[PDB]
Amino acid sequence: QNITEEFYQSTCSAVSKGYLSALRTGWYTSVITIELSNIKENKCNGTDAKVKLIKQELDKYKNAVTELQLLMFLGFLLGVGSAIASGVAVCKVLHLEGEVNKIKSALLSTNKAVVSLSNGVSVLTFKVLDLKNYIDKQLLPILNKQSCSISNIETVIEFQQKNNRLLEITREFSVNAGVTTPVSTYMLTNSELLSLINDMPITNDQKKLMSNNVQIVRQQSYSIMCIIKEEVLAYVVQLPLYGVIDTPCWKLHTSPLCTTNTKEGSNICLTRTDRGWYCDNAGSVSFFPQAETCKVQSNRVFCDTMNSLTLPSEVNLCNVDIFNPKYDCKIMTSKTDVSSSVITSLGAIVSCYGKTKCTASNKNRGIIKTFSNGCDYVSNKGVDTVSVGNTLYYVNKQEGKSLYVKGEPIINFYDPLVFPSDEFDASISQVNEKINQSLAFIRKSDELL
Amino acid sequence: QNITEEFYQSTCSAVSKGYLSALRTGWYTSVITIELSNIKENKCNGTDAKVKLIKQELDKYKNAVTELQLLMFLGFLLGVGSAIASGVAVCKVLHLEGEVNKIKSALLSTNKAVVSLSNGVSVLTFKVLDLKNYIDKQLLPILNKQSCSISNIETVIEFQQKNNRLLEITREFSVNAGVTTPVSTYMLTNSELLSLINDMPITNDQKKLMSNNVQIVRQQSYSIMCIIKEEVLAYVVQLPLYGVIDTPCWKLHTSPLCTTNTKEGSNICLTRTDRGWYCDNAGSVSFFPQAETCKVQSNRVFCDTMNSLTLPSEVNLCNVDIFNPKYDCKIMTSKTDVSSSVITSLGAIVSCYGKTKCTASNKNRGIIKTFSNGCDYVSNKGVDTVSVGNTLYYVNKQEGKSLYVKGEPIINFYDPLVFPSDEFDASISQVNEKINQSLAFIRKSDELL
Amino acid sequence: QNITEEFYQSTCSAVSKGYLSALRTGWYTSVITIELSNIKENKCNGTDAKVKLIKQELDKYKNAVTELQLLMFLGFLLGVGSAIASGVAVCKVLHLEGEVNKIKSALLSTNKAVVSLSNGVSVLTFKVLDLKNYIDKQLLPILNKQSCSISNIETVIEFQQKNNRLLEITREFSVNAGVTTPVSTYMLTNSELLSLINDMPITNDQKKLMSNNVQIVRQQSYSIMCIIKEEVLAYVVQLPLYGVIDTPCWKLHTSPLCTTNTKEGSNICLTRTDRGWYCDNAGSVSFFPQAETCKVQSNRVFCDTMNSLTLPSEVNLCNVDIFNPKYDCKIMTSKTDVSSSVITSLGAIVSCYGKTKCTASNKNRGIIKTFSNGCDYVSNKGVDTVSVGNTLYYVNKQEGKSLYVKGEPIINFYDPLVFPSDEFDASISQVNEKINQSLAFIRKSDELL
């Protein structure tokens, strides 16, 4: 643990360090067979209510089978790469001539085995439920008669339970237009998922890390509905394969830092655009700009790599002071003055401007601070409430240290009355070049006159 | 009621007035206990089908319990303040030493009571269902034998109903990774929600306003899964606490206003960026830029305050004419000419340009209007259809007045051939300063030459 | 079929042609009645468990009825036109005096008929389920007594099934606050949907195209819960009415194209902002900028027209070379250098810059290509994996041709050290005018000195 956090007032940003990493790098496919049984028609016209119930359940089964048969900041630097592609290839291979027959003929004695398709591939296959014996040898031979009669009541319960399970599966396929995410409990039982993870050919540390957080690995999985033929139903489940384990993985937070003045409209200032998760992998650091693309869960930062960047390992240099001519980190200059507040993982940062009232609070002492102009930092050491203007925020509650590096705002260094403004992706060097060009132009203009 | 609407052609904007307000300002927590019963193993190996069904349902119950055990415009001026924080604190307090034991020992005679945790806090607690008696003195003493036999059939139905309820609850926890929104009917019944609202320590007007719109208050609630131990399951439900009631709360709508010309490419014009809900609270007006953050429901504008602003009470000054040097409201200058149409709460605004065909229609008179160049307003007084180019829109149908303030477009005031363009957050003063600087520069250049 | 694709290296873009089109243009409404039966109270206090189960199910029914009674790039050029408007009008007409009584009195002998409301309108009406005979003729006359007793067990199963269906409907209305999308299997079964489609007053080709893709037409539908009165429940289902069929409909894809250099920071370049679906309709082409607004399904591009443009039919002129002074297509000039990759429908485009490593791969030959600086195109003819930096992408697998039009990047034509940059919607003419103005200004400055 030991989640540390630092706040830098030179740029008015916050960094949170201590989180471990778990980065996915590859997909994995598996075939699930739910083999059905062929039913054609019913002929018996009995009077007893049990026959009517069984016939109604069989009609619901047939309707479900027919329906399933008929079913067959800095954000614009990511890429539109497709998500589900391996499952599509697996389903296309399954659609080929006779491969499903080979799979069915290779799974007659054991419910779990390893089957090889055409070309070259190794995919796990798993069989669920059983409908080739109960409905073929027990109910089918008697219904196709003239005087059917069922002298029992538990068979109805069992049949409706199995039909309810299958109908739930087919309705889940029906509603979501053939693609579902995440996989529900109906599609994959917990024990079956554990068996699949155990049998999946990876190392031991990855198995240990993935088997203790089945919720996360279920959240990021996928399902593809596949060919229906030869009395057997098979679909494809796609499970992520985590590739980067136990590396330092920190977080960044930004907030506007503007100078205060009595004159309205002269509030040029600076802001950062490096939100999201920085993280370490290989030799070049990753980058997740969207904070909603992945979720922190139990001191871990499980995150996809499809929407990520490839920044050099020297990006961790402007977090101390944005002066070094080694790497610039995307200033967000503007000319707006609005109060705001952000709640980082351990503390709170309040940028309070103008005449708006901004105060911290407590559960037993009421008002405890009187935040002045500019941006300030309050730590989780006795406060549980921050009010800004006429809106209220709650502060997170955890255990950790809270440092405070004093400094001086950098906006005061910049001279007003000459300032570019309205740059969405200013990178320090660009704004400095613009300032130098403007100064040279005005100097030449006054010298020549 | 009396939903009035006005259209200003000077800037081509629409204002809708008459809506009452309901602004949330604080959260509230409650603890729900669904206490289970401990089951270890089954030994009887009877042959009767009822025993098999009961054993299967008990196995499903145990698997569910084990799985739950293992489970434990202007948009970038809002703030990233956390949503669920009070529930986290309540769960953390519950996780402390022996508090759950105190809660369980204080809820042995009455199903509803008030319990106080450590430090200082007052949280309501509620008990649902009953599984400490049915499964402990009826099924457990007889299953743990050698010759179990159940000579009844309704017990199976009752047990399957209770197990279905509990398994639905645990599956809905399982699928959504431990956080659900909004709370489903399974988690909180109508009677329990009404009892909690009645017992909530608030005034009478808030209770009257919230008890008649239970759908809205259910939509904005939250649920957190909490500690499992000592044969009792408890989780946290978070219900919003509305704080601002019965204040004027109007709506704004914008549309591009551009001049027409025969020459292609010379279509510099102006647009607004004040979409969303203006509203009144305290002494400084609020602001919700996103129109999808909250929903209008039955002449009310229920809206969260986490994503909101703190604009001064003088913002209602550029809605008449954007000339007064008191407050600027964020021009959106551009150099694009595309036709568009917007459907406000009572009428339609169509900005029709170029050679595209744009016409209103009716259900009994066909074509009724022949909208010319520029932006025009059509009211719901005989029209129910607007076609622009090759796309179709339906107009809302309500009852209210429709005014029309004639004026003159303000783009004609601006002189072309010198115009900044490509400013995302121009604020009238900035564009005027740019124009003045350009005019001064060109004047000096021609004077010195 | 024959999905062809071309890649133009002049601007580094990709075009995919061959897809057929299916464009929606209008809505349609239908009334569904689920007529209930009135129940007031229960008086019999029998001891048998069957009476208890029936009473509990009746109480659940009453609670559900009471709950339902109480329930009574280039993205900012689209428009905020309302989605559900026809259903609102239909419900408002239904709410008028006595129309529901007329509908109920006109549907006493046949379950399907055509009824006309006030003013003028023609809406289909449909009746589902039956609760005016089972519960009012069998259970009500015997429960309202002193010594009720039910000597059967199948009635419980039938009643629980019907009550489960009705409670599922009312719960799904309850959770989603009165508006649901898409319609689940509960509100509309397969046979009823097929009957409604067959009875829909449209041509034959549209019926043939829509009856084979019921998933898509169900995905884009809507459901509005409507007036409750006179012991009859009615709601409105809104089904799309496709209007444009069998027209050419192609797709465009873009990727940054930048020059390479050893000096860091001097990497001015150009990018396109014409993502989404171009498509043909009438005489003016449509435009869908968002790629997530509609889904490709089985060689068809079903897409709503609510969020679309009205571009002239001459837009298909800058796809060959952006030089012709006929139409400009929105350059996205910038000054950033980041590697990226995009996976089009048949191939992959990789823009590889700097020191990052970018390689294609294969399942039987390992590394197969060594992509150099700039942007390159790889086709699906032996590759199934693309790695860029430290991230991995899979390539789509289909059948089709892959052309390659060689050329020269246009950014080499532009002379550096004088270049506007930071224009979000540059349109070739604008950047050329800026360049000409800057050149004229500097020429005058050096001539006068």
Side-chain angles (χ1 to χ4, degrees), chain A residues 30-32 34 169 173 187 223-226 233-237:
Chain A
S30 168
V31 190
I32 312 296
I34 197 62
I169 296 169
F173 286 164
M187 185 180 288
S223 165
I224 295 97
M225 202 295 308
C226 296
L233 197 163
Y235 52 76
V236 173
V237 289

Side-chain angles (χ1 to χ4, degrees), chain A residues 161 186 215 336 390-391 393, chain B residues 56 171 174 281 286 305 425:
Chain A
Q161 278 182 3
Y186 283 147
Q215 294 323 113
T336 304
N390 56 304
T391 183
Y393 304 82
Chain B
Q56 173 186 302
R171 88 159 70 248
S174 179
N281 175 27
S286 283
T305 196
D425 183 23

Side-chain angles (χ1 to χ4, degrees), chain A residues 94-268:
Chain A
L94 282 189
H95 182 74
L96 206 63
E97 293 297 309
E99 277 287 345
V100 59
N101 194 1
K102 170 178 170 62
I103 293 172
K104 196 176 71 180
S105 170
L107 207 72
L108 73 165
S109 73
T110 313
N111 71 335
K112 183 194 293 191
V114 182
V115 65
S116 178
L117 312 164
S118 83
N119 296 115
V121 65
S122 278
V123 298
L124 272 297
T125 177
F126 296 97
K127 183 185 289 185
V128 176
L129 288 179
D130 48 299
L131 283 189
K132 284 286 280 189
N133 57 4
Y134 180 75
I135 207 173
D136 186 65
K137 181 266 290 180
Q138 278 191 25
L139 281 72
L140 174 66
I142 66 168
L143 295 174
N144 277 357
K145 274 312 161 191
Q146 195 214 40
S147 69
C148 65
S149 183
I150 304 184
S151 65
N152 261 332
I153 211 66
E154 292 79 356
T155 52
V156 186
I157 307 292
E158 303 218 300
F159 197 63
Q160 65 182 357
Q161 278 182 3
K162 309 196 167 180
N163 210 6
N164 174 36
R165 157 77 179 264
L166 180 57
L167 191 151
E168 275 297 316
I169 296 169
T170 188
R171 83 160 66 243
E172 184 173 281
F173 286 164
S174 179
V175 176
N176 220 331
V179 161
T180 47
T181 183
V183 293
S184 305
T185 308
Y186 283 147
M187 185 180 288
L188 269 162
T189 55
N190 206 279
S191 74
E192 181 56 2
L193 182 62
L194 266 294
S195 66
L196 197 54
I197 301 299
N198 176 36
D199 206 2
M200 182 179 72
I202 53 167
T203 52
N204 211 333
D205 212 1
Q206 298 155 27
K207 275 192 290 293
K208 203 47 73 188
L209 188 153
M210 187 185 334
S211 172
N212 306 345
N213 294 71
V214 303
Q215 294 323 113
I216 283 304
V217 66
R218 175 176 317 246
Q219 181 85 37
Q220 282 167 352
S221 68
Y222 269 99
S223 165
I224 295 97
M225 202 295 308
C226 296
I227 62 170
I228 188 65
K229 71 163 55 177
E230 210 193 356
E231 321 185 330
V232 55
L233 197 163
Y235 52 76
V236 173
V237 289
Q238 197 170 353
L239 267 59
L241 187 135
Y242 294 137
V244 172
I245 303 287
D246 292 329
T247 44
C249 205
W250 69 84
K251 189 190 196 192
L252 187 53
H253 275 133
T254 175
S255 162
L257 161 53
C258 308
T259 174
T260 183
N261 201 243
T262 177
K263 178 58 180 55
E264 182 57 59
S266 61
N267 288 326
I268 62 170

Side-chain angles (χ1 to χ4, degrees), chain A residues 73 154 158 161 185-186 190 215 219 336 338 341-343 363 389-394 397 422 441 445 449, chain B residues 25 49-50 53 56 67 76-77 80-81 85-86 120 171 174 177 281 286 305-306 310 425 430 441 444 448:
Chain A
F73 279 149
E154 292 79 356
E158 303 218 300
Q161 278 182 3
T185 308
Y186 283 147
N190 206 279
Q215 294 323 113
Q219 181 85 37
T336 304
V338 164
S341 76
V342 289
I343 302 299
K363 203 158 313 299
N390 56 304
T391 183
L392 189 65
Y393 304 82
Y394 274 29
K397 290 194 64 61
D422 301 80
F441 161 69
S445 73
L449 267 62
Chain B
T25 192
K50 278 148 276 185
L53 301 189
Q56 173 186 302
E67 178 182 357
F76 48 90
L77 280 83
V80 71
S86 191
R171 88 159 70 248
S174 179
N281 175 27
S286 283
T305 196
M306 300 295 158
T310 312
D425 183 23
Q430 283 173 238
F441 162 69
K444 189 251 286 183
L448 271 296

Side-chain angles (χ1 to χ4, degrees), chain B residues 6-207:
Chain B
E6 315 179 10
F7 164 84
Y8 296 108
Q9 206 168 341
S10 279
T11 303
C12 195
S13 68
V15 285
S16 159
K17 313 197 201 219
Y19 292 63
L20 277 296
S21 69
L23 282 72
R24 176 265 288 272
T25 192
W27 292 96
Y28 197 51
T29 63
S30 166
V31 189
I32 310 296
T33 55
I34 197 62
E35 53 170 337
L36 313 163
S37 288
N38 45 355
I39 200 75
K40 35 175 187 178
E41 86 261 9
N42 287 337
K43 328 183 67 164
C44 81
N45 208 1
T47 303
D48 195 359
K50 278 148 276 185
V51 166
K52 177 57 194 176
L53 301 189
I54 282 301
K55 284 197 307 181
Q56 173 186 302
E57 299 199 359
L58 207 72
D59 270 348
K60 258 209 290 187
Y61 172 81
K62 156 72 67 200
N63 209 50
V65 176
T66 293
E67 178 182 357
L68 191 151
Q69 170 73 42
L70 277 182
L71 190 150
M72 171 183 102
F73 279 150
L74 210 68
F76 48 90
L77 280 83
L78 298 189
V80 71
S82 195
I84 58 169
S86 191
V88 175
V90 163
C91 295
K92 193 150 297 307
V93 174
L94 282 189
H95 182 74
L96 206 63
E97 293 297 309
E99 277 287 345
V100 59
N101 195 1
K102 170 177 170 62
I103 293 172
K104 196 176 71 180
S105 169
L107 207 71
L108 73 165
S109 73
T110 300
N111 71 335
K112 184 196 293 191
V114 184
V115 65
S116 178
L117 313 164
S118 83
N119 296 115
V121 66
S122 277
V123 298
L124 272 297
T125 177
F126 296 97
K127 185 185 289 185
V128 194
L129 288 179
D130 48 299
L131 283 188
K132 284 287 281 188
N133 58 3
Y134 183 75
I135 200 176
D136 187 64
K137 67 97 173 181
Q138 280 189 27
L139 260 66
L140 172 65
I142 62 170
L143 295 174
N144 278 358
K145 274 312 161 191
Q146 185 179 2
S147 69
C148 66
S149 182
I150 300 185
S151 65
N152 262 332
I153 211 66
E154 293 80 355
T155 52
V156 185
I157 309 294
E158 303 217 300
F159 199 63
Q160 91 176 4
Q161 280 181 3
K162 310 196 167 180
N163 211 5
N164 174 36
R165 157 77 181 264
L166 179 57
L167 191 151
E168 274 296 317
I169 283 174
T170 189
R171 88 159 70 248
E172 201 183 284
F173 286 165
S174 179
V175 176
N176 220 330
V179 159
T180 43
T181 179
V183 293
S184 305
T185 311
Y186 285 152
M187 293 180 183
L188 275 163
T189 56
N190 276 130
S191 71
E192 181 66 11
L193 184 65
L194 267 295
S195 66
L196 198 54
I197 292 307
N198 177 35
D199 208 2
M200 193 146 89
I202 47 172
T203 52
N204 211 332
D205 213 2
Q206 297 155 27
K207 277 192 291 293

Side-chain angles (χ1 to χ4, degrees), chain C residues 50-110:
Chain C
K50 277 149 275 185
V51 168
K52 177 57 194 175
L53 300 189
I54 282 301
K55 284 196 307 182
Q56 174 186 302
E57 299 200 0
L58 206 71
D59 270 348
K60 258 208 289 187
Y61 171 80
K62 157 72 68 201
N63 209 50
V65 176
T66 293
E67 174 186 6
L68 195 149
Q69 173 71 42
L70 277 182
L71 191 151
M72 196 182 207
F73 280 148
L74 211 68
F76 48 91
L77 280 83
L78 299 189
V80 70
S82 195
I84 58 169
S86 190
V88 176
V90 163
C91 295
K92 194 151 298 307
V93 174
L94 282 189
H95 182 74
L96 206 63
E97 293 297 309
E99 278 287 345
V100 58
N101 195 1
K102 170 177 170 62
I103 293 173
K104 197 176 71 180
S105 170
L107 207 72
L108 73 165
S109 73
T110 313

